[PDB]
Amino acid sequence: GKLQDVINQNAIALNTLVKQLSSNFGAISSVLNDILSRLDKVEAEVQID
Amino acid sequence: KSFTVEKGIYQTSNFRVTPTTEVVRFPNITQLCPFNEVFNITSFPSVYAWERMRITNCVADYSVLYNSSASFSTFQCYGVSPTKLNDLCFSSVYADYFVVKGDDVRQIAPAQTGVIADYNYKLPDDFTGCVIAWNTNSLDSSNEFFYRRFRHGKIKPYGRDLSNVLFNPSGGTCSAEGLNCYKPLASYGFTQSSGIGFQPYRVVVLSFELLNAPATVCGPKQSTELVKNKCVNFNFNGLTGTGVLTNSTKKFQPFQQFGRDVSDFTDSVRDPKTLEILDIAPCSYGGVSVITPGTNASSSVAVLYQDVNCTDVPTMLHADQISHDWRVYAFRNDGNIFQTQAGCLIGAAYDNSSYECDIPIGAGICAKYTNVGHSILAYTMSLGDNQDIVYSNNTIAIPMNFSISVTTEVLPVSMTKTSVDCNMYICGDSTEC
Amino acid sequence: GKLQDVINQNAIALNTLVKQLSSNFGAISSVLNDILSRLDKVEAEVQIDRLITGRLQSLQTYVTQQLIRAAEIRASANLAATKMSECVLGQSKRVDFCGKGYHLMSFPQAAPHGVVFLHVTYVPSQEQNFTTAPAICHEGKAHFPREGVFVTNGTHWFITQRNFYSPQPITTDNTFVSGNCDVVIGIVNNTVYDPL
Amino acid sequence: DNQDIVYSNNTIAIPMNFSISVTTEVLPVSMTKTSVDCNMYICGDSTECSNLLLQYGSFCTQLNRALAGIAVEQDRNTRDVFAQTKAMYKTPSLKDFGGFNFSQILPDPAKPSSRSFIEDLLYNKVTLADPGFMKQYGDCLGGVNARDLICAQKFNGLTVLPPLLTDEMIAAYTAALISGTATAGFTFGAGAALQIPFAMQMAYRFNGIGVTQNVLYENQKQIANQFNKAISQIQDSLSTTTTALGKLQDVINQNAIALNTLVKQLSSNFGAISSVLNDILSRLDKVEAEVQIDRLITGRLQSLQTYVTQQLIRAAEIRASANLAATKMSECVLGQSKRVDFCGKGYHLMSFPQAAPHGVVFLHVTYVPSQEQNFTTAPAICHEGKAHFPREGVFVTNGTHWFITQRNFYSPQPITTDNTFVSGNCDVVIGIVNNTVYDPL
Amino acid sequence: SSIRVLTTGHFLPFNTNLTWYLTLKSDNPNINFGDGVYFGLTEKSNVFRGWIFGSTLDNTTQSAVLFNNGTHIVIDVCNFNFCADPMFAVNSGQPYKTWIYTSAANCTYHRAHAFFKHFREHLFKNVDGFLYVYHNYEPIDLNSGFPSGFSVLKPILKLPFGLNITYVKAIMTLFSSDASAYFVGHLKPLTMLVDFDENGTIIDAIDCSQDPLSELKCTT
Numbered sequence A: 001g002k003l004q005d006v007i008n009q010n011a012i013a014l015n016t017l018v019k020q021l022s023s024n025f026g027a028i029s030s031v032l033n034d035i036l037s038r039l040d041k042v043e044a045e046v047q048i049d
Numbered sequence B: 001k002s003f004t005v006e007k008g009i010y011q012t013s014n015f016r017v018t019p020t021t022e023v024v025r026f027p028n029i030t031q032l033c034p035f036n037e038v039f040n041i042t043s044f045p046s047v048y049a050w051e052r053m054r055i056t057n058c059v060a061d062y063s064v065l066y067n068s069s070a071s072f073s074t075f076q077c078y079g080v081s082p083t084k085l086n087d088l089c090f091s092s093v094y095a096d097y098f099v100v101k102g103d104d105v106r107q108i109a110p111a112q113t114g115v116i117a118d119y120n121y122k123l124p125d126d127f128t129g130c131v132i133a134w135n136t137n138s139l140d141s142s143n144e145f146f147y148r149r150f151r152h153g154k155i156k157p158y159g160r161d162l163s164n165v166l167f168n169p170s171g172g173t174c175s176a177e178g179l180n181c182y183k184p185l186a187s188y189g190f191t192q193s194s195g196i197g198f199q200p201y202r203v204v205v206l207s208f209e210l211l212n213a214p215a216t217v218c219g220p221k222q223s224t225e226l227v228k229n230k231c232v233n234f235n236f237n238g239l240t241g242t243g244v245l246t247n248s249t250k251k252f253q254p255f256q257q258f259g260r261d262v263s264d265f266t267d268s269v270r271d272p273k274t275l276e277i278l279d280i281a282p283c284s285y286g287g288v289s290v291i292t293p294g295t296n297a298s299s300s301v302a303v304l305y306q307d308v309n310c311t312d313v314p315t316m317l318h319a320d321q322i323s324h325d326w327r328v329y330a331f332r333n334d335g336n337i338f339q340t341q342a343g344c345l346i347g348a349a350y351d352n353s354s355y356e357c358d359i360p361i362g363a364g365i366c367a368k369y370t371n372v373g374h375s376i377l378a379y380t381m382s383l384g385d386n387q388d389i390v391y392s393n394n395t396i397a398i399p400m401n402f403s404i405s406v407t408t409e410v411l412p413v414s415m416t417k418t419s420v421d422c423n424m425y426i427c428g429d430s431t432e433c
Numbered sequence C: 001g002k003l004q005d006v007i008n009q010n011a012i013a014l015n016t017l018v019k020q021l022s023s024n025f026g027a028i029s030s031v032l033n034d035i036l037s038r039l040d041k042v043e044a045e046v047q048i049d050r051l052i053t054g055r056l057q058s059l060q061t062y063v064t065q066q067l068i069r070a071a072e073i074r075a076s077a078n079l080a081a082t083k084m085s086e087c088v089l090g091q092s093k094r095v096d097f098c099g100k101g102y103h104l105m106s107f108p109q110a111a112p113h114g115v116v117f118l119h120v121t122y123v124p125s126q127e128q129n130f131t132t133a134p135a136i137c138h139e140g141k142a143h144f145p146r147e148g149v150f151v152t153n154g155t156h157w158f159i160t161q162r163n164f165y166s167p168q169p170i171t172t173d174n175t176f177v178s179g180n181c182d183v184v185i186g187i188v189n190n191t192v193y194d195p196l
Numbered sequence D: 001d002n003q004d005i006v007y008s009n010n011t012i013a014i015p016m017n018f019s020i021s022v023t024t025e026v027l028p029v030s031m032t033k034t035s036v037d038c039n040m041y042i043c044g045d046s047t048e049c050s051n052l053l054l055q056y057g058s059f060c061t062q063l064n065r066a067l068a069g070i071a072v073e074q075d076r077n078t079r080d081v082f083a084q085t086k087a088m089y090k091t092p093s094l095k096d097f098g099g100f101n102f103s104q105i106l107p108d109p110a111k112p113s114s115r116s117f118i119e120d121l122l123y124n125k126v127t128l129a130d131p132g133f134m135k136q137y138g139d140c141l142g143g144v145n146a147r148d149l150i151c152a153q154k155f156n157g158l159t160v161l162p163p164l165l166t167d168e169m170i171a172a173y174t175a176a177l178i179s180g181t182a183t184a185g186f187t188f189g190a191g192a193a194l195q196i197p198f199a200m201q202m203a204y205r206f207n208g209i210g211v212t213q214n215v216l217y218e219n220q221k222q223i224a225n226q227f228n229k230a231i232s233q234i235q236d237s238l239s240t241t242t243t244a245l246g247k248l249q250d251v252i253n254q255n256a257i258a259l260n261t262l263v264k265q266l267s268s269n270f271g272a273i274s275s276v277l278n279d280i281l282s283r284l285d286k287v288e289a290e291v292q293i294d295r296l297i298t299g300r301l302q303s304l305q306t307y308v309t310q311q312l313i314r315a316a317e318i319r320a321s322a323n324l325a326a327t328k329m330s331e332c333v334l335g336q337s338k339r340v341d342f343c344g345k346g347y348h349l350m351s352f353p354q355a356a357p358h359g360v361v362f363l364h365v366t367y368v369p370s371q372e373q374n375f376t377t378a379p380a381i382c383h384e385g386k387a388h389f390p391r392e393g394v395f396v397t398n399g400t401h402w403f404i405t406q407r408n409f410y411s412p413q414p415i416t417t418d419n420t421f422v423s424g425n426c427d428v429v430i431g432i433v434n435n436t437v438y439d440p441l
Numbered sequence E: 001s002s003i004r005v006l007t008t009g010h011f012l013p014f015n016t017n018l019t020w021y022l023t024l025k026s027d028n029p030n031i032n033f034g035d036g037v038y039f040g041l042t043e044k045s046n047v048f049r050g051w052i053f054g055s056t057l058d059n060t061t062q063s064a065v066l067f068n069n070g071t072h073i074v075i076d077v078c079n080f081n082f083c084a085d086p087m088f089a090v091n092s093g094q095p096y097k098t099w100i101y102t103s104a105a106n107c108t109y110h111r112a113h114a115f116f117k118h119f120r121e122h123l124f125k126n127v128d129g130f131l132y133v134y135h136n137y138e139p140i141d142l143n144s145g146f147p148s149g150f151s152v153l154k155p156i157l158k159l160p161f162g163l164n165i166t167y168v169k170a171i172m173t174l175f176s177s178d179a180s181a182y183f184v185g186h187l188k189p190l191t192m193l194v195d196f197d198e199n200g201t202i203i204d205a206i207d208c209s210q211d212p213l214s215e216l217k218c219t220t
């Protein structure tokens, strides 16, 4: 169980890392394309930051 | 954050302050800036043929505009506050002036659309400056003013075109006025009593660069005589801060004014009112630690400073700007001030005897509260007791008795288990969050 | 002090998690109901998000410190387990592993979040000096002790253990013969009893 | 490298000689203790930043508590490792104990540096990043020390605290350990000190391996010369190699680059218009400046928290290494161990500790046999109906006679009524040979 | 001073290809203006001087000229009527007539100053309604194709006109009673890494994305 446990943990951490890209963090969207396609430079810099 | 401390040695966080004198250094400029030449020239160009002028060797004292008869309907500044225009210095200043329709005053702004913003006059998205406008219906209503109406593209954020070729809506040049061939320049209809969105307005646009180059135009601030070798709050061309100023040996090219280190802190500067390079350093330095024998036992403390030499302390421990309770700790009349390998201990007496450590100070020095009335006593740690044993090559020691001993050893095993609810901590009785 | 320390930090961190609920984190208030009582949906959804991120960071710091402390407690528990295995259910020859002297016994007692070992050990005392020899030869052959040392009475020679004093006569046993007594430094001349 | 050994099923290999080897093992013990002031890092010469950090000072108290705990543990580790003696035994005037030269691991009465020569060689091979703990304010503004790493480190509120025990105290501890080991054996590690001659002590150490007392007493000069040659050889190897002390230098380098990264991470904007607090306040009003300063405050607090977390993890690893070093010092310097490869590679006899910066160096003295030779062996020998078995060792043959000998050394002895015991009749064990047994008449 | 920073902008890529143009004693094409151009020229008799900026290079669109007269640097943005070849005529070692344009009116700018043995470098950039000019100077050998090495350019002047600049041209000189060459590059958006000495001088620079070693040094 120990070796399978560390394999499962190493898989679960990497799967959790890629699932956290869908958060907005207080911005308009989690995608950088529509933020640049809908806003000017000044506000898009704030959202991207 | 407590009213009763325990026995030990702690670290402090410099609650004192330095209310030193101020210095102000501004360039030697006395000519008043031509506010009248710009705002009272009675000849402004069309928006499509706007012109630009430079401003140098100026003093930007706009309060003289209160002495005139000019009232501005729009005065909006971008990237800077209007209340800070009297304290700053600007490096390069350009003024663009023209005449606009009156309903297109809103189009003179970053990130705008319309006829003027697309074909006549544009501004960059990251624009720093101010836009001023006012109504001139009694002056410009009997003159010809034009604007570009047709174009095959959008102009650059700072660009103009004075071409007067014939416009064909799909293709090249028609070269014959008529069907599908129009003049791109349209004329404003400026008649008396036409409305309020059709009356001419005069617009001026100023552009600044802040704190990145030597400055030629500054506000009306009176300078101060320069001092050295003391930490002061300064003002060099609009750059504030606090610290000591010293001579420096770096000479750089005359297009550079400031100097930044790795942490982007201003370390080297040039000077106005003279030409000389200077180094700025903060005047907060050194580690301060305090030693107390508890609170109910006594209220006296001993303070040691990690990085001072305890023969010339008060250069870094200037007692003039602080209370007498720190004057009694900066210098001591009797022998309660001495230098250890960890620094300079003040308020404790030294002893030549060695005991076990009670309060660790550092570098083999400890301290304790003793009866020798009561005072803080510092001493050198003792590793143990000597035994001066000798070596004999024909003699052995053998025990003749024995004893049975019981010893204790305590080890932790587990700790408390805690569950945390995500909501009811970040939120709670709030469905909006 | 270790178990009290374990209780004290676990209380202190949990109490510190409640003090950090009174921070604005760049918002106009730390109370969530005052934000929505004065602002519209926009400009309050902006200010709620910074509070949410700050409280999430405050939780994450506590979780990380709990993980590190749990690792230290796991190491201490492993040491306690191997000590219980090696010293309660047996006798140890490892020096200063259970007690101070020569290990004899150990007894465990429970404690809140801990264990307490009572180690029963043997210690020698009442020292005495004796003149010793590396070997004793009587014929040309040299004799060496199988164990112990060759100490003297002042007039006689005996053999005894190192950790206790119990003199015995030098006989054919407790002794082995190898070589001649002509190259060993410190050879003394004394007789040896022979059971006839 | 391949060896290709073979199974013989009837022959055994017994060493004819032996050699003395001295090895080296290096463990870190402690790391540097630092203290961080939130002011002069997140703020500094700025009252508004302090008034905005007054609501964040609880995190600062948390970070200071963590760093203070780390420093306390670091001061505890070296006392746990080194302070093992009950008394400070004086160094004997004679450094020779039966041909064994102890002069290269003990301080000399000429008083050059009050520490050992090998201990002196352990220093000046790794380099401290900061030569001395005293850095005055005049030294930071003399015009020559411009753009210095430690001076720019100090201006941001990051200081380094000195250890409680100086290097001379650690050297005195190690000298007391060595001088108590030689003149009193390992008996002073449990109870009072019992004096014993060094040759008899070495006979005791050889008896704990499986070799009789005599082997030293006919070969004392060879053992002493091998010990001296090994000491000179490891001195030469330590002098002419600069890659064997990598752990302590690694610790120093990691601490230095962590502090340098913390210093140089002050140039980020964190979504504000600038990274300098003075230029924002001189061109913006109060409302926008409060937000743009709070962004920088949050970013710098995060960058401090990351450093504190890394320091905690490194402190845990250093604590584990210090526990291993303390256990090894207790089990191998104040005694003789029988766990294989715990102290050295061969059979452990002695160990001597030497003080190193932020660590300790052990010189393990081991026993290794050599000069192998094949011998035909038998499980048992019977002459009457009864069958005899060896009490210890094995049975080997000259080719004409049969003897009994130890496994670790070739010492042939006649098969008498002693050193053997009888159980059963010789009709069940495979390989029983017939040979006479000497009987004392 | 004494720091290693990296910046992103429009730079000439390392080990890139220039274009060889020669003045024949027996050319001035309309070179495109992209994100910026680099001009490097080798001369001995001060033959090459001057540039022409614009989009159509006719009298329907404004154009900019910046040249040397042998005693003055005349720069003025006017509506020019450029003929087939902008030229410069010198008789017996002294100037006597300049042939660079025919007519010019509606003109909104004017400025003037008082002024293979050598190598001259000039870099032009046009952002935000400005024209940036950078200059460097070093003497080179008697005969070489392109002087290899490393040099850092310094700004001289910053010209405030808002013009549609898409083409550049060159002004030559012929003797009316020798040969030279100039090389033209093209700026590209790249990432560079630089280091400074204890003084304020740039000593070395690495162009990332050129080869794997410089990419490794960019990462490290």
Ligand SMILES: *[C@@H]1O[C@H](CO)[C@@H](O[C@@H]2O[C@H](CO)[C@@H](O[C@@H]3O[C@H](CO)[C@@H](O)[C@H](O[C@H]4O[C@H](CO)[C@@H](O)[C@H](O)[C@@H]4O)[C@@H]3O)[C@H](O)[C@H]2NC(C)=O)[C@H](O)[C@H]1NC(C)=O
Residues within 6 Å of the ligand: B152, B153, B154, B155, B156, B169, B170, B171, B172, E055, E056, E164, E165, E166
């Ligand atoms: C600076 O000056 C340059 C040089 O004159 C100029 O570039 C020119 O831009 C125009 C306008 O985009 C280009 O003309 C185009 O050419 C082809 C046909 O030859 C077509 O793609 C275009 O036809 C369009 O016409 C209408 C435009 O709205 C549409 O209704 C129609 O459907 C077509 O899309 C167009 O005529 C010309 O080719 C370039 N010239 C060069 C040499 O590149 C540039 O625009 C000027 N810069 C600024 C900022 O004004």
Ligand SMILES: *[C@@H]1O[C@H](CO)[C@@H](O[C@@H]2O[C@H](CO)[C@@H](O)[C@H](O)[C@H]2NC(C)=O)[C@H](O)[C@H]1NC(C)=O
Residues within 6 Å of the ligand: B067
């Ligand atoms: C404000 O404007 C008035 C005029 O409106 C200025 O008064 C003139 O000052 C000049 C210079 O000294 C005198 O020669 C004139 O006689 C004044 N009067 C007029 C009607 O021109 C005045 O100086 C301005 N400034 C201030 C600070 O009041």
Ligand SMILES: *[C@@H]1O[C@H](CO)[C@@H](O[C@@H]2O[C@H](CO)[C@@H](O)[C@H](O)[C@H]2NC(C)=O)[C@H](O)[C@H]1NC(C)=O
Residues within 6 Å of the ligand: D095, D096, D101, D103, D104
């Ligand atoms: C122990 O070893 C040393 C080193 O090989 C021997 O040599 C001495 O080295 C020290 C170094 O400081 C000198 O001061 C001595 O003068 C050297 N002695 C001789 C005789 O050359 C040293 O002799 C050895 N000690 C013994 C007791 O044999």
Ligand SMILES: CCCCC/C=C\C/C=C/CCCCCCCC(=O)O
Residues within 6 Å of the ligand: B113, B114, B115
């Ligand atoms: C009838 C609307 C059909 C849908 C149109 C929707 C989106 C496309 C653009 C909309 C903006 C409205 C026109 C703005 C014109 C600005 C003119 C000026 O500033 O003077």
Ligand SMILES: *[C@@H]1O[C@H](CO)[C@@H](O)[C@H](O)[C@H]1NC(C)=O
Residues within 6 Å of the ligand: B039, B040, B068, B069, B070
């Ligand atoms: C311009 O100057 C004239 C002459 O002094 C004055 O009458 C007029 O009011 C001025 N105009 C403004 C807008 O100040």
Ligand SMILES: *[C@@H]1O[C@H](CO)[C@@H](O)[C@H](O)[C@H]1NC(C)=O
Residues within 6 Å of the ligand: B351, B352
């Ligand atoms: C302590 O010893 C030092 C060194 O000899 C001496 O100067 C000092 O006077 C001593 N102090 C006392 C109180 O005896």
Ligand SMILES: *[C@@H]1O[C@H](CO)[C@@H](O)[C@H](O)[C@H]1NC(C)=O
Residues within 6 Å of the ligand: B400, B401, B402, C126
């Ligand atoms: C050993 O110590 C015990 C306890 O004090 C004492 O009664 C006894 O007499 C001692 N024995 C000898 C032999 O000295």
Ligand SMILES: *[C@@H]1O[C@H](CO)[C@@H](O)[C@H](O)[C@H]1NC(C)=O
Residues within 6 Å of the ligand: C153, C154, C155, C156, C167
């Ligand atoms: C030791 O010597 C003394 C003095 O001669 C003698 O009386 C005694 O019997 C001897 N033996 C023992 C065991 O004490």
Ligand SMILES: *[C@@H]1O[C@H](CO)[C@@H](O)[C@H](O)[C@H]1NC(C)=O
Residues within 6 Å of the ligand: C188, C189
């Ligand atoms: C016994 O040994 C001593 C000491 O070496 C020696 O003087 C003496 O002659 C020896 N006795 C005999 C009988 O060999």
Ligand SMILES: *[C@@H]1O[C@H](CO)[C@@H](O)[C@H](O)[C@H]1NC(C)=O
Residues within 6 Å of the ligand: D016, D017, D018, D371
């Ligand atoms: C053991 O090795 C030593 C050192 O080389 C040598 O002098 C000695 O003769 C060897 N002994 C035997 C028995 O081979």
Ligand SMILES: *[C@@H]1O[C@H](CO)[C@@H](O)[C@H](O)[C@H]1NC(C)=O
Residues within 6 Å of the ligand: D398, D399, D400, D401
């Ligand atoms: C052992 O074998 C050798 C020959 O290798 C022989 O000379 C000798 O007598 C045998 N016996 C003994 C007891 O050494």
Ligand SMILES: *[C@@H]1O[C@H](CO)[C@@H](O)[C@H](O)[C@H]1NC(C)=O
Residues within 6 Å of the ligand: D433, D434
């Ligand atoms: C002992 O065994 C050997 C080997 O087989 C054999 O030669 C011999 O005869 C045996 N002796 C007796 C008495 O059986």
Ligand SMILES: *[C@@H]1O[C@H](CO)[C@@H](O)[C@H](O)[C@H]1NC(C)=O
Residues within 6 Å of the ligand: E059, E060, E081, E103
């Ligand atoms: C503009 O250039 C054209 C083409 O050469 C020419 O016919 C025309 O006269 C010029 N116009 C002016 C005003 O110079």
Ligand SMILES: *[C@@H]1O[C@H](CO)[C@@H](O)[C@H](O)[C@H]1NC(C)=O
Residues within 6 Å of the ligand: E105, E106
């Ligand atoms: C342009 O030049 C022409 C010819 O000299 C002149 O008639 C006209 O007024 C000028 N236009 C402008 C806007 O300067």
Ligand SMILES: *[C@@H]1O[C@H](CO)[C@@H](O)[C@H](O)[C@H]1NC(C)=O
Residues within 6 Å of the ligand: E197, E198, E199
């Ligand atoms: C830096 O400037 C100094 C002072 O002008 C000069 O001597 C030196 O050559 C320059 N370069 C270096 C590398 O020090």
